[PDB]
Scaffold this active site. Sequence first.
Site, PDB file in Angstrom:
ATOM      1  N   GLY A   1      41.661  48.383  50.505  1.00 46.65           N
ATOM      2  CA  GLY A   1      42.405  48.629  51.746  1.00 46.65           C
ATOM      3  C   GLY A   1      43.067  49.996  51.752  1.00 46.65           C
ATOM      4  O   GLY A   1      42.626  50.915  51.057  1.00 46.65           O
TER       5      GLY A   1
ATOM      6  N   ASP B   1      51.603  39.205  43.971  1.00 46.78           N
ATOM      7  CA  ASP B   1      51.606  40.290  44.969  1.00 46.78           C
ATOM      8  C   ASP B   1      53.013  40.558  45.510  1.00 46.78           C
ATOM      9  O   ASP B   1      53.265  40.458  46.713  1.00 46.78           O
ATOM     10  CB  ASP B   1      50.601  39.990  46.113  1.00 46.78           C
TER      11      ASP B   1
ATOM     12  N   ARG C   1      48.458  34.008  51.345  1.00 44.19           N
ATOM     13  CA  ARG C   1      47.562  35.064  50.854  1.00 44.19           C
ATOM     14  C   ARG C   1      48.023  35.736  49.547  1.00 44.19           C
ATOM     15  O   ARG C   1      47.206  36.316  48.845  1.00 44.19           O
ATOM     16  CB  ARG C   1      47.322  36.126  51.932  1.00 44.19           C
ATOM     17  N   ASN C   2      49.324  35.678  49.251  1.00 48.22           N
ATOM     18  CA  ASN C   2      49.890  36.184  47.991  1.00 48.22           C
ATOM     19  C   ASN C   2      50.159  35.109  46.932  1.00 48.22           C
ATOM     20  O   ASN C   2      50.867  35.362  45.951  1.00 48.22           O
ATOM     21  CB  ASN C   2      51.175  36.967  48.287  1.00 48.22           C
TER      22      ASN C   2
ATOM     23  N   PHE D   1      46.587  50.635  51.131  1.00 48.98           N
ATOM     24  CA  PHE D   1      47.578  50.754  50.053  1.00 48.98           C
ATOM     25  C   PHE D   1      46.984  50.864  48.642  1.00 48.98           C
ATOM     26  O   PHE D   1      47.633  51.413  47.747  1.00 48.98           O
ATOM     27  CB  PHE D   1      48.552  49.571  50.096  1.00 48.98           C
ATOM     28  N   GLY D   2      45.773  50.345  48.437  1.00 53.47           N
ATOM     29  CA  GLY D   2      45.141  50.390  47.116  1.00 53.47           C
ATOM     30  C   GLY D   2      43.744  49.797  47.037  1.00 53.47           C
ATOM     31  O   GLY D   2      43.064  49.651  48.054  1.00 53.47           O
ATOM     32  N   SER D   3      43.321  49.474  45.813  1.00 43.45           N
ATOM     33  CA  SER D   3      42.024  48.839  45.550  1.00 43.45           C
ATOM     34  C   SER D   3      42.135  47.843  44.401  1.00 43.45           C
ATOM     35  O   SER D   3      42.815  48.116  43.411  1.00 43.45           O
ATOM     36  CB  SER D   3      40.968  49.887  45.192  1.00 43.45           C
TER      37      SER D   3
ATOM     38  N   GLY E   1      38.070  44.496  46.276  1.00 41.48           N
ATOM     39  CA  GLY E   1      38.672  44.771  47.582  1.00 41.48           C
ATOM     40  C   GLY E   1      39.192  46.196  47.641  1.00 41.48           C
ATOM     41  O   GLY E   1      39.468  46.806  46.604  1.00 41.48           O
TER      42      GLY E   1
ATOM     43  N   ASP F   1      57.502  39.396  49.949  1.00 39.89           N
ATOM     44  CA  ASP F   1      56.271  39.134  50.719  1.00 39.89           C
ATOM     45  C   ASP F   1      55.624  37.772  50.375  1.00 39.89           C
ATOM     46  O   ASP F   1      54.428  37.699  50.086  1.00 39.89           O
ATOM     47  CB  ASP F   1      55.289  40.300  50.484  1.00 39.89           C
TER      48      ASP F   1
HETATM   49  C1  LIG Z   1      51.935  41.147  40.307  1.00 35.96           C
HETATM   50  C2  LIG Z   1      51.697  42.436  41.050  1.00 35.96           C
HETATM   51  C3  LIG Z   1      52.614  43.473  40.887  1.00 35.96           C
HETATM   52  C4  LIG Z   1      52.459  44.700  41.528  1.00 35.96           C
HETATM   53  C5  LIG Z   1      53.464  45.775  41.347  1.00 35.96           C
HETATM   54  C6  LIG Z   1      54.118  46.484  42.361  1.00 35.96           C
HETATM   55  N1  LIG Z   1      54.964  47.370  41.881  1.00 35.96           N
HETATM   56  N2  LIG Z   1      54.871  47.235  40.530  1.00 35.96           N
HETATM   57  C7  LIG Z   1      55.692  48.083  39.677  1.00 35.96           C
HETATM   58  C8  LIG Z   1      53.984  46.288  40.167  1.00 35.96           C
HETATM   59  C9  LIG Z   1      53.691  45.949  38.746  1.00 35.96           C
HETATM   60  C10 LIG Z   1      51.370  44.886  42.370  1.00 35.96           C
HETATM   61  C11 LIG Z   1      50.445  43.877  42.554  1.00 35.96           C
HETATM   62  C12 LIG Z   1      50.589  42.652  41.895  1.00 35.96           C
HETATM   63  C13 LIG Z   1      49.579  41.619  42.153  1.00 35.96           C
HETATM   64  N3  LIG Z   1      49.680  40.335  42.053  1.00 35.96           N
HETATM   65  N4  LIG Z   1      48.447  39.808  42.448  1.00 35.96           N
HETATM   66  C14 LIG Z   1      47.707  40.831  42.769  1.00 35.96           C
HETATM   67  N5  LIG Z   1      46.443  40.887  43.212  1.00 35.96           N
HETATM   68  C15 LIG Z   1      45.684  42.132  43.240  1.00 35.96           C
HETATM   69  C16 LIG Z   1      45.799  39.711  43.785  1.00 35.96           C
HETATM   70  C17 LIG Z   1      44.727  39.266  42.823  1.00 35.96           C
HETATM   71  C18 LIG Z   1      45.107  38.803  41.498  1.00 35.96           C
HETATM   72  C19 LIG Z   1      44.180  38.396  40.596  1.00 35.96           C
HETATM   73  C20 LIG Z   1      42.806  38.417  40.954  1.00 35.96           C
HETATM   74  N6  LIG Z   1      41.710  38.076  40.279  1.00 35.96           N
HETATM   75  C21 LIG Z   1      40.659  38.314  41.142  1.00 35.96           C
HETATM   76  C22 LIG Z   1      41.095  38.791  42.332  1.00 35.96           C
HETATM   77  N7  LIG Z   1      42.467  38.863  42.227  1.00 35.96           N
HETATM   78  C23 LIG Z   1      43.414  39.281  43.143  1.00 35.96           C
HETATM   79  O1  LIG Z   1      48.349  42.012  42.615  1.00 35.96           O
END
Ligand SMILES: Cc1cc(-c2cnn(C)c2C)ccc1-c1nnc(N(C)Cc2ccc3nccn3c2)o1
Length: 273
Positions: free
Chosen positions: A30, A171, A157-158, A32-34, A28, A153
């Site tokens: 968007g 997320d 979806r999260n 804010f990131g990838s 994915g 949040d």
């Molecule tokens: C936990 C978490 C923490 C942060 C964050 C913000 N600030 N700091 C310091 C941190 C460390 C950012 C994102 C996450 C996160 N949690 N879930 C996801 N995603 C991308 C969803 C996902 C997970 C797993 C997955 N597998 C296939 C597809 N997928 C999709 O991102």
Amino acid sequence: GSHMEELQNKLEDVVIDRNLLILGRILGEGEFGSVMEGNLKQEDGTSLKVAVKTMSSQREIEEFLSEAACMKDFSHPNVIRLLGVCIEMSSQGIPKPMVILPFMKYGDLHTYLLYSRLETGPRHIPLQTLLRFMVDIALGMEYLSNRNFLHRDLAARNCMLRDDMTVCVADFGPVKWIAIESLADRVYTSKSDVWAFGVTMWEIATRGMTPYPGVQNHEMYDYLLHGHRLKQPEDCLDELYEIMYSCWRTDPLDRPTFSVLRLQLERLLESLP
Ligand SMILES: Cc1cc(-c2cnn(C)c2C)ccc1-c1nnc(N(C)Cc2ccc3nccn3c2)o1
Ligand SMILES: [Cl-]
Ligand SMILES: [Cl-]
Ligand SMILES: [Cl-]
Ligand SMILES: [Cl-]
């Protein structure tokens, strides 16, 4: 001191060597990131498939590493486990921080629910299983609330589905998930997360409907102000609706805790045949 010692230990744990990580395809992408595929080489020689989330002064980088170090410390089966962080640098001199997560092939819970209403996707999800998703989320949030960590949040979806169909919250920080006081005063507590959980419960019971059909985002504050809340889904149990309705009480003090909510949900799930 000890507070400083505890922080320094956590910061040692969180960082991953860039050469131990191999990036894959874009999943994915968007604003804010990838999100990307990856391989993480582990201590035992073998590689693990991971998800990599790529996110501008060094103050914000230290703040990112500090925050990452705290999240790394979470250990609960209904909270996503942060495996670590990497900081790659750009040619312009802007740092690109990366977050490494367990790969979850079943994806987010919102998409799963929507797919369950289509022939090709997973089959019809019965009431027992939908309630098990809610219990799982409540357990994860009960854990985070005990550590005085606000999600900020929380939404379907999260929430991510693991390979065993266990749900975990993810997320970490969407007008229609935000509590009435958090729209008014711009303040956020564990009871704001409880409001979001109620809305997340409603998403699950409707199998993925967007909250408040026929109400615009700009109309949301005045809608809630006059006492209106999410409507009971069709064929939703009165007891289940009373649980989610309790999450949206106007006074945040009157909303139950995640532990109280979790017990109510497990009891309701046990009563089903
Ligand atoms: C936990 C978490 C923490 C942060 C964050 C913000 N600030 N700091 C310091 C941190 C460390 C950012 C994102 C996450 C996160 N949690 N879930 C996801 N995603 C991308 C969803 C996902 C997970 C797993 C997955 N597998 C296939 C597809 N997928 C999709 O991102
Ligand atoms: Cl996990
Ligand atoms: Cl998994
Ligand atoms: Cl829908
Ligand atoms: Cl509604």
